[PDB]
Design a binder for this molecule. Structure first.
Ligand SMILES: [Mg+2]
Length: 278
């Protein structure tokens, strides 16, 4: 049947210059860390130590600077536009906040994205965005984000927004979180661990089983962080939709292997990331 569209996602793309670096190596998507200040306002795109093996952990920007860069990379006609860059996952570092600031953090995030990425609806960046939350108990962040875009008069930009819970929680507990949050679509499911440590495919397989089941809730599954061809092949054979990597050119080389070219292709803008592949 048809080739599954795959998101090749650059890991820890936290400096404006790294957006071209990863996209030019073959990524169609990036993952970016977002730190929060003591008032739940996004502050930096900063991961810090410890981080993946072989990476400098300390590159960062002011978050709104990063968003203006990412807007340039994803706005047709801009001198820096990358037509291939179609998804951004924000790894929201809400661990520094109290649980009762999760909703406030969603609202602050929406205000910044509206102003600096979507430019108040004037010729904004076109990428789809996944709000990845590391703690299921922070699910109120989603309502905050949606209510703030609604208040600001751009509720439609939620068509460009999806969701992930990154903590490797049990799949049924993830689904309960989404039920609590009132969410019924646009759901990505991460599974992974730092490239520094080993991991098998058991939870990836459970996430794919949920995604492909008649009444499951996951639309897409992505596995992180994968820097080896063998691991790439294992994840593709498991049926994942995304692979997060420090080396997009390794993943691209695997997808260009003749057996994999028959079964997968690199996702473009017209592949809606919220639709389960059939
Ligand atoms: Mg991260």
């Amino acid at each position: 049947g048809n080739r599954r569209p795959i998101w090749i996602m650059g890991a820890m793309v936290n400096a404006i210059g790294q957006i071209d670096e990863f996209v030019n190596l073959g990524a169609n998507s990036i993952e970016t860390d977002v730190s929060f200040d003591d008032n739940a306002n996004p502050e930096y795109t900063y991961h810090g130590i410890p981080c993946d093996c072989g990476r400098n952990c300390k590159k960062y920007e002011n978050f709104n600077d990063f968003l203006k860069g990412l807007r340039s990379a994803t706005t047709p006609g801009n001198s820096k536009y990358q037509e291939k860059l179609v998804l951004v996952v924000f790894d929201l570092k809400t661990g520094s906040l109290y649980d009762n600031q999760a909703n406030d953090a969603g609202k602050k995030l929406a205000k910044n994205l509206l102003q600096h990425y979507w430019n108040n609806g004037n010729n904004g960046g076109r990428a789809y965005i996944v709000l990845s939350i590391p703690d299921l108990n922070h699910y109120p962040l989603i309502k905050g984000f949606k209510d703030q875009l609604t208040k600001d008069g751009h509720p439609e930009l939620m068509d460009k927004v999806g969701h992930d819970f990154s903590g490797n929680d049990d799949i049924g507990d993830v689904g309960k979180a989404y039920k609590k949050a009132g969410i019924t679509g646009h759901i990505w499911q991460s599974d992974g661990i730092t490239n520094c440590l080993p991991r098998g495919l058991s939870r990836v397989n459970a996430a794919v089983a949920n995604r492909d089941s008649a009444n499951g809730f996951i639309n897409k599954v992505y596995y992180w962080t994968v820097d080896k061809r063998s691991t790439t092949r294992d994840a593709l054979d498991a049926g994942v939709d995304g692979i997060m990597t420090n080396y997009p050119d390794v993943i691209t080389d695997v997808l260009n292997e003749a057996a994999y070219k028959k079964k997968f292709r690199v996702a473009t803008y017209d592949d809606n990331p919220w639709v389960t592949f059939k």
